[model samples]
Target: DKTVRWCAVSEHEATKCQSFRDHMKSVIPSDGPSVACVKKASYLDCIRAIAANEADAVTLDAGLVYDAYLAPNNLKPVVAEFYGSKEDPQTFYYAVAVVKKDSGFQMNQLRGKKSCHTGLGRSAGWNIPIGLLYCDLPEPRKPLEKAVANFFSGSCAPCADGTDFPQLCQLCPGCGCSTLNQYFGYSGAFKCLKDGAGDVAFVKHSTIFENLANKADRDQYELLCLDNTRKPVDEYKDCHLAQVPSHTVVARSMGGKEDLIWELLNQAQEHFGKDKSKEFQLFSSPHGKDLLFKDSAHGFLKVPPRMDAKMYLGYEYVTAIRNLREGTCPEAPTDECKPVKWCALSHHERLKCDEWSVNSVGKIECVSAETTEDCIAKIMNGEADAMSLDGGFVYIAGKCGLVPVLAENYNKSDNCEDTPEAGYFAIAVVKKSASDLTWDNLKGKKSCHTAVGRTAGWNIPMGLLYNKINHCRFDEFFSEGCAPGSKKDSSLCKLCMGSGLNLCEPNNKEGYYGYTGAFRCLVEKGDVAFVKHQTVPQNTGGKNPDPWAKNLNEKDYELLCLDGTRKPVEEYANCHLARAPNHAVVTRKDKEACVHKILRQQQHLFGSNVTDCSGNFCLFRSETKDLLFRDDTVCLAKLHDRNTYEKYLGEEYVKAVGNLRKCSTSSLLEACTFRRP
Candidate 1:
């Protein structure tokens, strides 16, 4: 009733595969998993048939894995090819641009040169190189593959259309399209360059070395570096365009036998793994050398417990493949959907946002600004449309006419069966030795804050200060402090050691800027620190193993309760400053509906760890420390029609913020209200 149908694309290879499958059953004896060889004309058919429940699994290249995991048949990677020891395995390979030593060509000089590729949609051959060319193209609006078709005078990219774009498929010397062509895969792409049909060959690092293992003149080939420079073939580690992921075994994502399939592979490897037995080799057959997988693979490594293709293929590599799918493929017109321009506030957020943009499959485009206030200004002027705002910043964005489209609903679980809450408490912490310190006696003490205008650090503390001191001259309250993002000459900035290029920046580079960074300022520089309750645990005691904090116990810190008393840090739920609203996705009022619709779709596609949890392009997480969005959010809660900031944030919190506003201007007010035009 049940057989693990192993897919074989080549009929000749399937004959050998059938005999090999029999060897596994005979060798493993009692508990061995059964296997049945299934035939398909191509790997694409192998994946489609599996989606139709006709087959169980297939070994596929990372590029093909990208295709199989798309709509029609969502697939998951079950095992990865490991080229090293099981403890420290190698699952990815370097993709290099191979050129002959005498080619006289640089990476930037390929305007009309002949080229060779492993295949049309393959990682090294097509995706990495073309993705690098995306920004340098003269006509960004044109189809990227067609642009590539015209870029090279001739190419041997198998499976590409030769009718409309004849130049792209001209170099294949024997047979027809796809694998039938003489020049396909790592061996064939190297053969194309070896046969003088193309100038540069996009292939894996071992291509030339493998082909020339028996030949002495292998030194005739060189690798083309991305820095408009060229290096010896051996310098691929430091001088390569991109690192392509390894081949993998894939199955239908849902209802797929994960444990049983892993058991089959695990048992099969004991008998037929690489070098386990020459008589019944697991990776090879007499019919073909690389019939089912790459021949250069050492063996198979178990994939992570739960890994779909997106997570298994890795976000950067998957993103590279998906970019080629939408930009350079024949399926549909890329960028047909109206693009959403997201604002990034720092370098790390910019890097993550770029990956997010690629993961969106052409629906998102990211624009960067130096500061959060600048990003808000970008939204206001229509230069960019959206960003995530903290509770304190939401009031400012609202006053500037921006609206909250969605709130980040964090799934913070309590011991009881209560529903998840939409707010976090603000708290201030003091050293355990500072027994004389109380919230009422905090004046003239050195303070450390998450940032100048952040919710827990600035707004709640200063708003309460306005209730008591009736002014915003916080410079007088805290004699010396480290409140990052303050003006360079301000009293708050005096304690910040983040000088030079990172001065006053709202990013990790600033020593006093985020929850972790501000807490770090407290650990090394200040007396009392302002941050969320979770921040201390995330960076202190045994939770954070950083050098400065490994010995710093959580028991040594106490919370400065507002009622002139102090308590343990864990009592923040009952004795905190204010219950402020959660972070929300902010957008201009005019484009609120469009932004909300796009975000909800993005959340469905890229949210949570279920399908995509590589920590690359997450809906909740940012690349840097909490710049664009918080990493721990569960989902983006939707907003009702015409929901204003005051209504969504509640009247009480807005009134408190307003009290702070009356005392002194928000440090970010000028930048948030600025219009570039």
Candidate 2:
């Protein structure tokens, strides 16, 4: 039908990159206007859908991940293949025959055509009959049919006499067409020619002709190439030929939106002319800034101060794109759609998304969360990205000069006004190459740019993003806008006279790095300063030493990190950095205390769950820690150290002996061997 779809690719790449469009064709419902794409055409999407049960199989090019190659333990490719290229009519080689000392009659001249064919099949039985006849004679004749009449009398069935390997006369009873011309397999062609059974037979071009030109078979059987085209009979040494792909179907699979997956596979066979077009494009991690792109010579993105645009708008854009692929969101099941369940606010809203109505925003899994510094940290460490904030962090990252802006999320107020307005920047990280800056002096100088965690590509790190805030800020800083705080109108001399820098938290304490670096330099370089959390970070497998301990310098890392020593007060204001508790035993402080009014109250608020000391540390007082995997726990010890937190957290609570009891029978102290205050 005009409305359905399908997909495909040229077989040279030798794989199924076209699976998505396949289902969009015939897979459409019989009575509906829509459809699903086919397999092989949209393989990758098919895989994603299969995970959610939206489709059947998942397919992909096998060469990229043959067991003989990469060794990542987690990712595995599917294994059922529908194509292969080695047998049957595909055996397009040749064979030949020769005589010795005029000792016997020519093969075709004798005929009984003493021909044999394994019961049926045109290739071996029928074709071989005509092949033997055209080989030895100058002019063709069937006199040979009468010469060996007994064998020529047609009867393919074996005699009731029974047979075994010792019988040679069983030829007519068992052999087929190829045998009539005395054609065996590829190797058999050369053997039969030698034994005087036939003058010419079929064999592979590589084994005989190519061999004659090699060291191992310099004096072997005379090589011939069979030019089977003008086939009354013609030859090219001993073989026939046709061009095709190795072990793959030689045609396209058929449809997808862009057919990108297989299109990429097909292009795989050709070399790109240093750039990309419909055939290809420089590819990078589809996620965000690729973690490992430094080898390419693109400059760096600031990572320490904030997450890049990719990480920044992570969930939102990804969900939007995923929703785009799903197209206006899917519909609610017919069974539940008739009379809407209005009481179920979530379900009703979701049904609207399914109906392709404007309510799709609330219909899907997206949310309008309040942007917080905690979200910034989550983006920084690869947890959450983007939020409904004042958009100040976006500028802060730019001020530091480490993040590149991909696209601006807000700004079109008319379109976004209905939604909680917020801004976001999309970004990518590129590697730096000396030749990249200027082909002249930029040859081999090495610089670390994008890292290993992102997808790989080049030329992508060159996009420049401009925002309206820049125009506004430039006017304000240059005194173009005279507002209440007229610092905007101050002359260079007046502003330069004062350092105007008094914002870093001083390293007066033993474990802090008194923020003291030149701020301007950091923004210029766009570097990232990995900050250690006062509490254990989720990613650390918990091996990092205590981030807030007084003896931090004794550990092997620089625990304190910042964008620059002399950060602009505004930037510092945005970071919201500070240190907090490991174990907070709650007790109240009195405003006016009397003698001996020292009240006695001991209560230790626990965190979500505990692993060891490190987890308990997280349980303490950090506001950011509480947001992720939100649960709580009592103070315990290190993750690896057995003497703490493990036994008590929510993990053991369900295992307690008494059903009504509040905790696990396996006490954290008993399970971990700890001493209490």
Candidate 3:
């Protein structure tokens, strides 16, 4: 007599759940798990019951899923509640900041204004809005609820009842953080805004349309955009604060009988779901609002096996909620007071780093430098904590006492624990239209490079060229080129294009910098480009969204073979310059342990292949290309025993970079060597 103990939060929920229990008895086979209703005081109590195995499952809001996954509770969401049609169900909704059309306030001006929220810890009502506004608090150590209380004059954020933040409940017409509060839910919060009890209402995008069906009534409200602008109510897609995953059914993380629960719900939905049965409804409660599951939901989708609470609710939302619940202050008095200061090497990388810091919820911070060497120098002097460096710079940093913390993985495989391949391929690209331009006839051709001292962009390509030319003067080999970090007045810097004072700065600010920038130089001006194998495919054939790369085709490019023939871009394995080690993150020898820990957690949230990335921050993607990590990077692989640059880059690559550095060593390397013990 196996049965799924359904945890019910209230008497009404238990009553409705009893009906489901009785109805399932008639339909379920002798061998199938049947339903059994168990009453609890609240969802938190239900979560406790489920974790203790006293109950099996319960539906919960996405915000609550975060709490369920915390230690001791250890619950996971196994099924998602979806709205919209069965053919194309909507698994998420937008959290919007709604205000009256006549309100002359933008999102930035909401300080000291009255606000209405669906409920405390609710997705659209609280988490999204609070997370977006969390960074502006003057006192970083203060509780987020207290900060919200001080920021708003008076507000009705239901389920936030307490004497500490009495102002949070001052505008409410009820006693506690429940339905007893008049402004407790989507419609109630909208009513709070409609009745002028609040200036802004943080609710779902559909709240306005649901409350005011008529166009004239709906037209009275508008939405606040993150850009500080406001838009019409219907434009929530562009104006909302954040998009959140839908509510889900949660169970214990270990052996929670997910299969039995899914079977019961699946069969119940088939019998009583959406016009299936007249007497019993699986997705609705006519007697009470949202008694068992959300009345508006059309169906349930089984969650992917790999997804957990953090992956289901997404990293940004989870981090935001965590930061709010636990103050951003360090846990203990002896803990480091400062955030991990990641050294960003360019304007674009800095921009991405700042966003990453925001998404990281004060765990990581950003510091800017003009070049990779400057970043390495900052890390060496304790001004910065960590930064990703090419193998060429890793050699310098290793020599200067920094240790490898993590390595970027370019392999298509998902195993982050496995050791990555030795290296990625470096290729020389030329326009297919220039069929006459072969590797042997490349003398005096205009060339492009990612930057000086980079493995793919400089060292590997330049070392091979150095072997052939038998000279250290690369400027004489290429008639005109855009090699960032070269002498500004030389022909090597002739084709370099950066804006204003940023011209040829050896960073992303230089229009012809990095892999994508160097490829852009090939597309725009240079006759040949030295870049990684993925560079051509990543930029051409509408893969890149940038205006310059949108219409370009990959077929127009060809790889230059060392044997004097050209091959398609995909054939880089046989026709290439040399293989180079993937970029790696480096930190001080003493800081490697902590840096690795922070990055491993950070990647789980922002890394590629995360469960939900609809509108959230991605760690590896910078539309400008190669910010903190390469866009093609699958994960930040563990260094294992290859913790030193000599072991990580191998002897051949180390010697190749050494050969290139003999031509011209960076001044930073010389300074670091002088300071070395």
Candidate 4:
């Protein structure tokens, strides 16, 4: 019964995630409602996340708990532990990486070679291999206390502007690389390579061998594994590839009734068969809840929930170092992250602390302790005080042997979130996680976040970028309240999330007169579209003169989401890196050469004498302009007018975007267009 939430990390495992998901879909079918997705550390973490109010199902195996395949520290949890009947088995294959056939190369062979890299992709395929590569690190103990937690000081505790773990691996990438990439290369050469290349990536089956054989494009091809084990050694029973439970289902250990749990379980057992009617093919999946933990010991994942292991495991060493560099500190101090100064202060100081406390203002809710149990204890036993007034905390209090003196209790009916305020957090499905969300679901809503060149929040929605231009005003756009942790109120935020829409001023649907923020959410679904933010252009730009806030790096696109979803701050570790959109950076003849030339020519931009961006290498400026919209045709025309442009920009965050008329054929030319530092 911790104060913190939980999640199910099943869908991330490549070993069996995709296969099981297909299975679940087939069983459930298109006739039924879509499934809810969430972030989880491991199969066990998935179960607990549901119990702790994180997610509905684990999705399945996603943790690196195998005794083999990982480094000395890579072991995670397994929720399938307690259940078994070999007769009616329930388990799935975990996430795995594969090499291309014909290439006859193994993972170790592709050292410096470039494959279809997807650092921006957040899929089970992307997350599992990416996260498992770093299974050697120990768990972090700070921030769970105070300093780091402060970033969410206000109501929706906005996702801090950092990507490093602690900050989500913000530091590691400061150099030329990141934690996940530095350790594991981004070569995806085994997928269904089409007539050309679109969705061309790693093998889809148990191994590269499977995907290749299935493709049958070539009778002779080889397969490779992400680990150097060459093969699964003895860990897997078959000695071939092992399966990790991928689809796990779970409900809040707190909110759900035994009947509800049984019903959901029953549904999962049959979810896959039904999805087949919708054109989706489902493979057989094991039927066990995934479990996640720290290392192979299954440490914190044991019972009471000591740490958010499954969530944090996603971060790589690069992210860890970066967070150390970012140096996070929260607005409030709690025993988990800080020294608990509030408890030690003088009466007057304590009173001041109380006044400035999360509760005194009543703006912040549910952030009582690192875990929900802690919050429940305070409220009932006189230790905890305020939670999100949802009354669910009361149930928890009573369960823990504590008594709440509240006049009303919400035991029978759950009060759904349905109020508009300055902030309501939402989940950001990165290019990788985008599959978890859909365009139809995200249409016509406002999106809010901090973009490059601005210290405050920004709102960028897809509708704004659509061919049907909506002119927005400065007041409407700028003054519009920013919603953080949006995953919490997805029902209201779906339009924005699905449509990639942002607030440009509700009063002035036309963007020119409303409060204007920096972000511009480009709408387009499928695989390539992503909310792009031009990294901070280091020193030498115009407009507002604040130093730290300027020169926001386009490479550092910190994603945001709501708090209620049981997710780990670490799962999104690799979101901030210099990546050409996989969708846009196709053809080795195009991206590599183009980017190489630009970096060399602009090398001087990072020079010391030009110091201005707090030692940053570039600078960016913010000015409300129809100019933000570029039409590649005019080379200077408004971007919103598709009739005037032919330049191609498949939603991605990169340096030197296509200006005016034509999209630059090369990054070099695009870099030169800036003309200035």
Candidate 1 residue lDDT tens string, 41-137 = 9999999999999988888877788888998989887776777775645577788889988788888788788888988767687778777655444
Better of 1 and 3 by TM-score: 3
What's the C-alpha lDDT at position 168 in model 4? Answer: 25
On the 0 to 100 scale, the lDDT of residue 207 in model 3 is 88
Stronger candidate by TM-score (2 vs 4): 4
Instruction: Give me the displacement of residue 343 in model 1, in angstroms.
Output: 11
lDDT of 4 at 29: 48
Which candidate has the highest TM-score of all? 3
Candidate ranking (TM-score, best to worst): 3, 1, 4, 2
Q: Rank the candidates by lDDT, best first.
A: 3, 1, 4, 2
631-675 per-residue lDDT for model 4 (tens digits)? 110111111211101122122211112121131133222221211
Clashing pairs in 3: 159-177
Instruction: List the lowest-lDDT window of 10 residues for candidate 3.
Output: 668-677
All candidates: CA RMSD (Å): 19.9, 33.0, 20.0, 30.7
lDDT of 1: 0.75
Model 2 lDDT tens row, 1-677: 32222222223111122221232223334543332334433333333333333332222332211211122211232111212131222211222322222333443243333332222222222233333333332221233222222333232211212133212223333433343534344334444444545433333334344323453432434322122212212232212221111111111111221223223223322222113333422122223331111112111111111222223222222232223223232344242211111111133322322332122222212222233333333433224222211112232222211122111122234332123211111111111211132212111221111211111101111111012112312222222111112232332112111123311112122111211111111112222111212221221233433432222221221111122122222232232122111221110011011101111100122222334534333222333343211123222212121111122111211111112111212222121111110
Candidate 4, residue 458: how far the Cα is off, in Å: 71
| Best of the two (2, 3) by TM-score | 3
For candidate 1, the TM-score is 0.42
